[PDB]
Design a protein around this motif. Structure first.
Motif, PDB file in Angstrom:
ATOM      1  N   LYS A  60       0.007   4.957  -1.431  1.00  0.00           N
ATOM      2  CA  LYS A  60       0.233   6.228  -0.768  1.00  0.00           C
ATOM      3  C   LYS A  60       0.952   7.209  -1.677  1.00  0.00           C
ATOM      4  CE  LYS A  60       2.106   8.128   3.524  1.00  0.00           C
ATOM      5  NZ  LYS A  60       2.793   7.797   4.805  1.00  0.00           N
ATOM      6  N   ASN A  83       0.807  -1.211   0.000  1.00  0.00           N
ATOM      7  CA  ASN A  83       0.000   0.000   0.000  1.00  0.00           C
ATOM      8  C   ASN A  83       0.843   1.265   0.000  1.00  0.00           C
ATOM      9  OD1 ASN A  83       0.904  -0.016   2.665  1.00  0.00           O
ATOM     10  ND2 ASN A  83      -1.141   0.016   3.572  1.00  0.00           N
ATOM     11  N   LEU A 110      -3.638   7.515  -7.692  1.00  0.00           N
ATOM     12  CA  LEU A 110      -4.633   8.535  -7.401  1.00  0.00           C
ATOM     13  C   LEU A 110      -5.619   7.988  -6.389  1.00  0.00           C
ATOM     14  CD1 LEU A 110      -5.684  11.306  -7.961  1.00  0.00           C
ATOM     15  CD2 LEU A 110      -7.038  10.324  -9.796  1.00  0.00           C
ATOM     16  N   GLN A 111      -5.470   8.411  -5.135  1.00  0.00           N
ATOM     17  CA  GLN A 111      -6.315   7.925  -4.048  1.00  0.00           C
ATOM     18  C   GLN A 111      -7.563   8.799  -3.945  1.00  0.00           C
ATOM     19  N   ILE A 112      -8.355   8.751  -5.016  1.00  0.00           N
ATOM     20  CA  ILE A 112      -9.689   9.337  -5.050  1.00  0.00           C
ATOM     21  C   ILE A 112     -10.421   8.586  -6.146  1.00  0.00           C
ATOM     22  CG2 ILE A 112      -9.537  11.165  -6.771  1.00  0.00           C
ATOM     23  CD1 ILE A 112     -11.020  11.491  -3.293  1.00  0.00           C
ATOM     24  N   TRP A 113     -11.739   8.663  -6.141  1.00  0.00           N
ATOM     25  CA  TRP A 113     -12.499   8.086  -7.232  1.00  0.00           C
ATOM     26  C   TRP A 113     -12.279   8.828  -8.539  1.00  0.00           C
ATOM     27  CZ3 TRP A 113     -15.168   3.690  -7.331  1.00  0.00           C
ATOM     28  CH2 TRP A 113     -15.472   3.096  -6.121  1.00  0.00           C
TER      29      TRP A 113
END
Lengths: 50, 54
Positions: free
Chosen positions: A43, A39, A47-50
């Motif tokens: 980090k 993970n 792209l840690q968004i929808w």
């Protein structure tokens, strides 16, 4: 009479142990050896968004 | 005069920003654009603590 002696001498030794232990709670610590590196890419690289 | 100084100095620094904090290049910019100033509720994010007082 005289008498002389000369005791030349040498030794050697090569010990070795290979003790393995098996405590129970090491697998609890070993549950996430790859999770915190996998993970890490989430980090820092994805792209840690929808 | 100096109490008018202190009033003017007080209202000149009374201005407020909402600081976003993330490792820089294009992670959180798309967030604030399409989901804060365009007013959008229900923005979805990654589990990487990405608003845990971030």
């Amino acid at each position: 009479q005289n008498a002389k002696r000369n005791q030349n001498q040498k030794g050697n030794a090569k010990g070795t142990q290979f003790t393995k232990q098996y405590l129970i709670d090491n697998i609890d610590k070993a549950y996430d050896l790859r999770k915190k590196i996998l993970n890490e890419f989430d980090k820092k690289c994805f792209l840690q968004i929808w | 005069a100096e109490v008018a100084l202190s009033r003017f100095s007080l209202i000149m620094q009374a201005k407020f920003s909402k600081i976003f904090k993330s490792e820089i290049n294009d992670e959180s910019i798309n967030q604030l654009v399409s989901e804060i100033y365009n007013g959008a509720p229900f923005v979805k994010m990654s589990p990487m603590f990405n608003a845990d007082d971030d």
